[PDB]
Each structure stands twice: as structure tokens, then as C-alpha cells.
From a paper:
4-hydroxy-2-oxoglutarate (HOG) aldolase is a unique enzyme in the hydroxyproline degradation pathway catalyzing the cleavage of HOG to pyruvate and glyoxylate. The crystal structures of the apoenzyme and pyruvate-Schiff base intermediate complex are the first for any HOGA enzyme to date and reveal a tetrameric structure composed of a dimer of dimers as well as the identity of active site residues. As mentioned briefly above, the crystallographic symmetry of the hHOGA crystals generate a tetrameric assembly containing a dimer of dimers. Residues 26–259 form an (α/β)8 TIM barrel domain, while residues 260–327 form a three-helical bundle at the C-terminus.
A 2.5 Å resolution dataset was collected for the native apoenzyme at the National Synchrotron Light Source, beamline X25. The model was refined until the Rwork/free values reached 28.0/29.5%, and then used as a molecular replacement search model to solve the structures of the apoenzyme and the Schiff base adduct with pyruvate. Of the 302 residues in the mature form of hHOGA, 296 were modeled for both structures. No electron density was observed for the first six residues of hHOGA and the three residues remaining from the affinity tag. The final structures for the apoenzyme and Schiff base adduct exhibited Rwork/free values of 21.2/24.6% and 19.6/21.6%, respectively, and were of high overall quality, as indicated by the refinement statistics in Table 1. Interestingly, the packing of hHOGA within the unit cell supports only one molecule in the a.s.u. and a solvent content of 75%. The crystallographic symmetry, however, does generate a tetramer that rotates up the 3-fold screw axis, resulting in large solvent channels. A superposition of the apoenzyme structure with the pyruvate adduct (RMSD  = 0.19 Å for Cα atoms) reveals no significant structural changes to the active site other than a water molecule within hydrogen bonding distance to Lys196.
Author numbering:
A (entry chain A), B (entry chain A), C (entry chain A), D (entry chain A): 33 to 327
Write the structure that this text describes.
């Protein structure tokens, strides 16, 4: 029940020898816990989930749970390529305390990931999941959009409670909110760049990589939008566009981690094959933040 | 000066023998004149401008002028592939009474249409145009987005007064409004599907193919947005999404003309190579309107 | 009848004041006439046809005719966006001496350029053309591939004698040769980069921008391929790949004109909005030629 | 050393309860062993590797080894998203008898999979692999092409012996063969559809899903190409284009498995989320084979 609100999709910190740094993870989460988030999204794209072993994925979810108040929502990335693997991942993450499973669309075989394929995959996971399911569409990583007709069909399932859409197409989001209006189905935006427009069209939250460093600003944007302060919402939204692009489509996770370092959080390195930013990328990353008055 | 408001991009009617039907054009414009539009956009993509001879393009603009109150704005599509041709088209359209020139990005050589190329093309047209210039970005027809840095540079020109963006990317629109905030530069949305989100991010109007048949609804959406009625704006916006897609990306101009017939306007045929809708397309077109309560 | 062989798609030279330089055009054509080409392709993409007035397009075709032996084939680019305009352009170009009309696919309304639309457009032009018609598919400029099923249907027309394919997909070319094997229908490659593979799959020629400067090399590649010298064909083909990309997808017509200058032909400027190469582009253009031993 | 020749990328058979059917796998491999292949490619895209557990991936490679003559080459798909995971997978597959590791490009974070990222990933795997490494580029699944400059750099590594390219762009393949001519680096085509053109440009083999059912035909195409029988090679190549597309881009693995059933091999079901073909897809699959005289 109820997923409305702002979540940072949390990173996975690593040591100099590429192990998971649970100390730093815990430290970062205590800092982020100060912000009026609804909870944490663990092992979204931003958590480098493809780079973790099965049991790292489990242990990460468990530690996040232990570093959170119990009244905060833990949305766990349990998607795998295969339907059966996904079910098992979802069950095990429920067991270490996830409140909901966020399930990315299988996409290695886009060619054959039709509506019917995606509908079946999600229906089976929802049928067998002990926790509610959130659809997760993120085309910049997957090359695929969960189609609208599939979303509408899936919204009817009692154990499918909403979706996070990362495509940034507000017409699509609007259409989804409209077409699922008769269902218990809540739409979360997938980044801080199009949060305002999303609320305008009926989304009731956002999972934003940018809230790892500008949590208060992102939460302020939520408050302005829910409160009808659209004029101030606009000024704030505008100033978040470039920093948001900076840590998402422009420089990705290495950009996010670098910005985290600069803001006093533990950003640290990514796992190979992800690389450090070149000096020119660092420079450009700094510009997107400083020229919008954030650094 | 001042381009804010709603415009229908008007179609060009043709006779059974594919001539321009100026009688029907005039009849349609008298009907559309009843709606509180800011004016008419003539020879946008929706006017089938690529299919008209030089002098048809001129005569169409002239007739529209004669069928309009003088206090209504006539934005004329004067873009051609070559910079020099564009200048000449812009001058001649000024002479038959256009208030502003809407100039589509040259796109046959996308490969070489860099920022500098587009900046030069527009600077020359703006330098030599007797009327103000509106940038026109429509990737679904062109395969190219006028890049943001080019838009920002061009917004500084005294004779470039805004742009119509048809891409539907509200983050991009937001960014443009933000980055040009210090200039006289007004942003118009390029369709009724993302009108609300556009106003939210700072656009001050829309050129909407859908206003050829639901003019009052589109104008109502404008009123709700300017008036802070965001909740009602939403309900209305949602109901316009599918009919809007129906006459734009789904069925294009033949879809628009068919819907016009059904609403009692003169829609008529397009010029070859455009074709009639198949019966199944007609059926689907009807569904998008009837299931949203418009027909 | 019979379009097999190599053609350079000829450029249109311009003066310092952007007029058509017919003197330079004639001079270039006398030089290119030395090579064993089948003829000239006039007003392909490489002739900047979108940038010319109606009557420039006509006069260019007429002058090329006058500078050619009558036993050489003049393929004239007569495509326009509208079916009727295309017919008229085709008729008038026949009158100034074109041997065949090369008709680019209308593409401003890709969305509605279905197979049936393209089939009708071409059937009408072929029905009314006094000269044979060659289908012209060039997606890098158009954003569309003439679909295979349309090509097969059109190959059955008595006045449609082949196609130039510029996409570079040899599986598609192979399929087309196979599926039209029962018809009089000859396939020309659209660039020197994939000429060898094209001959291997059944194409019987090429229209190559690169033959404006390496005519003898391109003709040599033809000779090696027709003669079964596949091993030497390979060595030669390899050395043509980068210079070919240099004057096509990398630097386009400005790249071609620059290379023409350097080889002693008249390259000259393009019409705005096309721009000169930056010094770094010039440098890279030089590298693609020098490191493959051509300059 | 030496990877030239034809390989079928073998499927993974499953039981009615979605277990790996090692009996059927072994039976299929004994049948395919009759054809003059160079060996087997195990856990390419066609083996549904993303759908298998770690130890299934290992056990599959081990069983294939046991069902093969030792003089036949086993190329094992050991790629994972993370560089470290890939190293471990490569080591363990070497241990169960793989002759070479075929390593797909990590692609979940395309945005950050630059040349340098891909160069580092492959250099580390090649540095630590006990067996030679084959680069694997398959954009239809990944959304990314291993860039040419990266391929050229990697070809210099002593433990990187070639690549399988699945993109079908023969200009790119030609360029790669040319640019790596000074290295020990062999290029394999990624499908039977562009095998002939590949040999023409310098590839020395193919990994072809189609050889699971038309092994003798694919091997015949190899023989005709190596033997200079280009005219017969062409006739044969043409007839393989549609059946090849049928079991790859059109209907994928379910299409391949269905065709396998019809040819008397064990095709069987895929793992969810992959679905059965609809009756209309089955029909179309049958057409692509029957109309080319194969069924
Ligand atoms: K539900
Ligand atoms: K201005
Ligand atoms: K024919
Ligand atoms: K090597
Ligand atoms: Na709902
Ligand atoms: Na402004
Ligand atoms: Na033929
Ligand atoms: Na080599």
C-alpha cells in the first residue's frame, strides 16, 4: 500500500579493492535519512546491481533495511533477465526486509519482449511475490519502453501497485495515469529533471538519482508541487535540470559518485567496467552544478 | 512582439482534382475564427507546404490574411532548405501580410546541420526578414532537434522572438525557458498532447493540430493553466492525449482531415503521395475520439 | 534499357556569390569524362538539388547533357515531395536530355510514407514518365528505407528499370536482387565503400561520390569484380573505405568539394546552410586520404 | 590459435518443467557433429545464457565438451556485465574445457561504455584468461557496437585472437580486417545472412544460428567462397537470407527452436520470459523456409 513520495536510488559504495563498503553505505544512509524521503530505492540502475553477485544483492538490501527506520519504505531492485530468477530474487529480498519489489523489464532479447511476454513475466512475479510489485521502465539502460497497453493490463493485478518510469515522456506518463485511473496504481517519475511535469500529469512521486546530493531541494520541489506553488516549483525545477542530466544521461554513476564526494558523502569508485571521469568531464560536471548555484 | 496563445496550424484544402480549394479554406477559417485563438499558423507541417508550388504558398498566406481579423496573428511557414530561398520566401510572405515567419530547420543534410550551420542560417534570415522570426523544431518530420545551445544563441537576436518545439520533451523545453529567461523569447508547445506540462515549465502557448477540431477544448486548457486550475487542467489534458496522437503521430494529416470531415469542417483529401486512411485506421481514429468522449 | 556501371553523382559548383558556376561544371565534367564511367548522375544528394530553383535544376541537367558524349547515360534526380511535382520535373528533365529519372523517396511525412504510398507515388511517375525510372533510397538524408516489398512490386513495372540503394545493407541488397530476379531490374550500390560486396550479391554498378576524385580507382574496383579478381578487389576495396566515409557520412558535400579542390578539380563552396569544414575537419579529411595512400 | 570456419551457436534445450535437458543437448550435438563445422559456440545469445544460473552455464559448457571430438573448437560465452565477474567466468569455463572465451560487450550502462571502458574491460579479461579471447559485438541485443578504434587497439593484444561481429555492416567488417591486417586477428561473421559478403571483405568464418538446421548448406556456402565459386555462392546466399532472418531478427530463439522441431532436432521451449510463436508467426516462419525451397 502507498508508494507516493521521493526516494533516492542509493549507490553501492566500493572499497579501493572493489569490495562492497558496507560502512560507507551505512554512513551515507544515516546522512540521507535526515531528508523527508518516503524511503530508499536499493539496486535500481544507480546501485550498479548488474555488477553484484547474488548474495551481495541480498546483503546490500539487508544492510539498508538495518540502517533505516521501519516506517520508511525500502523498494528493492529484484529484476533479473529470467522470470523464474526474478521470482526467487523477489522472495529472498522480501525475506531480508524489502517492502516492495521494483522489477526492471527483461531486455536482452528486446526483439521478443512483446507486450504478452512482459505481461506474463510481471503477472508471474506478482502472483508469487510476497511483497507488492512496482513496474520499472528505464529505456536508456534497456532500449525498451514497457508499452502502455501492458502497463494498463498489469495495473489491474492486485499485487502490482505502481511503476517507476524513467523515459521522461510526460505525454506517456499522463496517458498511463489516465488509463489506470480506476486502479490502485501509483506512478513515480524516474528523475528530478521532469518531476514537476510528472506531478502535473498525475505522478505522485519520484525516484531521483539527484536526491543523493540535493535531497532537500528535491523534497522542496515535491512540497511546492503538492501545495499548488507552481510558480516557485518552476524556478526550482529549472535549476535542477542540468545538475540532474549531469548525474544521469551525461556522466552517469561515475558523475553521481564524483558529486557525492564533493558534497561530503562517500561517492568512491564504481566497479569495472565503469571508469573515472576524465578531467574535462569533471570540469563539465562542476559547471552544471556551479552555474545553477548549487556548488 | 507577443506570440503567446493558441494557434491551429491550418490545413490546405484540395479539390477532387487536387487544386487548392480557397473557398473551403475560407469557410474553415471563418468557423475557426470563433475560437479565442491568438491567430493562425499557415504552412506548418500540417498545411502540406512541401506539396505546394512557390506561388500557391504565397497565395495561401494571402487568402488566410484576407479571412482573418487584423488583430489576429498570422504565423507563416516560410522555411526552405536553402538559406537564400528562405530569405526570399520570408520577404514575400511578409508582403502578403504575415506577422511573423515560422522557419523550420533545414534537414535534408542532417549530417551537416550542426549548431553553427543552424545558427548562421537563422541569423541570416532574422537579419534580412522584415518580420520577426520564430524557430521551428519538428524532429518527427525532420529527424533533427534544433540544439539547445543554438536556441540560446539565437534567442539573443532582436528579430528572433521565440520558437515552436514539436519534440514533446518537457525537460528540453524547461531548459530552454530557463536558459533564455534574460531574452525576449517566447516558447510555444508543438502539440495539444503536452500543452499543460509546457505551460508548467514556462511555455506561453501552443500550435496544435488538434485545435482544428477541438478548438474550444484546447483554449479551455490554456485558460485552466493560466488561471492556476491545475486539477481541472489535468482531467482535460488526459482526455486530449489520444485524440491528439490520433491526428499527429498515429494518422497524421489524413487523420486530421478525416476528423475534420466528421466534425463538419471541410477536411477533404491530401495531395499525393499522402493517402486515405484504410477502414481499420478510420476505425481506430474514431475510437481515440469516442472513448475520450469527444464524438 | 541497361544502367550497369559506375557513375559519379556530380556536384553543382557555385561562384563566390553563390550562383551556379556552369563554366566550372563543364570543366569538371570534361575531366571526369576521361574515366570509363557509364555516365553521370545529376542532382543526387551530392548535387545539392534541394538548394536549387526549379529552373536551375533544369538548366544544370541541360548543361551536363551538352558536356557529355551522347553514348553516356545521364541519370537525372527529378524527385520532389509531391507526386504531381515529380511527374512534371521528370517530364521537363526528359526534355533537356535525361536518359533516366532517378526518383528519391518523398520523406517529409515519413510517418505516412507506407509501402502503398510509395508504390502509388512511383507507379504514377513511371506511368507518366517519358524516360525509364530508377528508385532512389537514401536513408541518411531521408530517414526512410524504401521497403523491400514495395521494391519487388515496383520492379514489375515496365518503366521502372532499377534502383540505387544508399543504405549499405548488403543483406537487403542481396534480398532485392533475389526477389526481383525474374524482372528487368538492375541494382546500383550507393557508395564506393560497399561496392565489392554489392557486386558479390548481384548489384551491377554504383553511383559513388568518391568517383568525383578517385574515378580510375572506382572503375578499377568494378573491373576486378566483374573479372573475378576478388583478392585484388579486396585490397582495393579496403583502401577506399575511409576516403569514402570521409566524403559521405563524415564530412558530406563540403568534404567532397574540399577533396576536389586538393585533386585539382573545382570543388568550391556549397550553398548556405552548408558550411566550410573547420581546420580540424580538414585535417581529418586529409588523414583519411593520405593514410590510405591516395594523397 | 586458428578460429576460421563455421560454428553453430548452440541452443540450450529445456524440459517441460524448464530444467536444462542435457539428454536432448547431447543428442542434438551428436547430430550436428556430422557437419564439417570448426566447432560449437556455446552460450552466445542463442544459448539463452542470460537465463541460466552460474553453475548451469558451467555445466552446459562441460557437457558440450564431453559430446565433442577434442579436435573441434569450443568457443564459450563467458561475458558478464562486470569485468571481475567475466574474468572468473572465463577461468571456470577454461577449466571445464573451453578452447576460447567469447566475451560479449557489457552494455547495461551503454552511456558509459566508451572505447576506453571497453578497451580496459577486454584487456583485463585477456590479461587474466588462460584461454584466448574473442571479442563479441551483437548490437541487436546490446544496443552497442564495439567501436573500430577499440577493436584495432585490442587486436594487438597477444591473447585476443579475433571477433564475432553480429551487426551485418560489411563496410565496418572490411575496415576492421584492413586495420588489423598486421595482427593475429580473425573476423567471424555473426550470421548466415551476410556470410558471403563477409568472406569477400576478409572474414574467415561465421557463427550462424541458421547452421543449427541448415548446417550442410552453410558449410557449402563456406566451401564455395573459399574456392572462388562466387556465382554459385551468390545463388546459395540469396536462398539463405530469409530463413536466416526468420530465426534471428524476425522470430529469434523461439523461431530457431520451432524450426529445429520441424527438422527433427530437439528445439523445445525457451525459458520465460521468452514465449511460443503465435500461429501467424509459425505460419510466416514456415513460409520463409518453404518459399526458399528448404522445407
Ligand atoms: K493494482
Ligand atoms: K530575441
Ligand atoms: K522493370
Ligand atoms: K592478437
Ligand atoms: Na490509479
Ligand atoms: Na524569455
Ligand atoms: Na533482375
Ligand atoms: Na589479421
Amino acid at each position: 500500500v502507498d508508494i507516493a513520495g521521493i526516494y533516492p536510488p542509493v549507490t553501492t559504495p566500493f572499497t579501493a579493492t572493489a569490495e562492497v563498503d558496507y560502512g560507507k553505505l551505512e554512513e551515507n544512509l544515516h546522512k540521507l535519512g535526515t531528508f523527508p524521503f518516503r524511503g530508499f530505492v536499493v539496486q535500481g540502475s544507480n546501485g550498479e546491481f548488474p555488477f553484484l553477485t547474488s548474495s551481495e544483492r541480498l546483503e546490500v538490501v539487508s544492510r539498508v533495511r538495518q540502517a533505516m527506520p521501519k516506517n520508511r519504505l525500502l523498494l528493492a531492485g529484484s529484476g533479473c533477465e529470467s522470470t523464474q530468477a526474478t521470482v526467487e530474487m523477489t522472495v529472498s529480498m522480501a525475506q531480508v526486509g524489502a517492502d516492495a519489489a521494483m522489477v526492471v523489464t527483461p531486455c536482452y532479447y528486446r526483439g521478443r519482449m512483446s507486450s504478452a511476454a512482459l505481461i506474463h513475466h510481471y503477472t508471474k512475479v506478482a502472483d508469487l511475490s510476497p511483497i507488492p510489485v512496482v513496474l520499472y521502465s528505464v529505456p536508456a539502460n534497456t532500449g525498451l519502453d514497457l508499452p502502455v497497453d501492458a502497463v494498463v493490463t498489469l495495473s489491474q493485478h492486485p499485487n502490482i501497485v505502481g511503476m517507476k518510469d524513467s523515459g521522461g515522456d510526460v505525454t506517456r506518463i499522463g496517458l498511463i495515469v489516465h488509463k489506470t485511473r480506476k486502479q490502485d496504481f501509483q506512478v513515480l517519475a524516474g528523475s528530478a529533471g521532469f518531476l514537476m511535469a510528472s506531478y502535473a500529469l498525475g505522478a505522485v512521486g519520484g525516484v531521483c538519482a539527484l536526491a543523493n546530493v540535493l535531497g532537500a531541494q528535491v523534497c522542496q520541489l515535491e512540497r511546492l508541487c503538492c501545495t499548488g506553488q507552481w510558480e516557485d516549483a518552476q524556478k526550482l525545477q529549472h535549476r535542477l535540470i542540468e545538475p540532474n542530466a549531469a548525474v544521469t544521461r551525461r556522466f552517469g554513476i561515475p558523475g553521481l559518485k564524483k558529486i557525492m564526494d564533493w558534497f561530503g558523502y562517500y561517492g568512491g569508485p564504481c566497479r569495472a567496467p565503469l571508469q573515472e571521469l576524465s578531467p574535462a568531464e569533471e570540469e563539465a560536471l562542476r559547471m552544471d552544478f556551479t552555474s545553477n548555484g548549487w556548488l
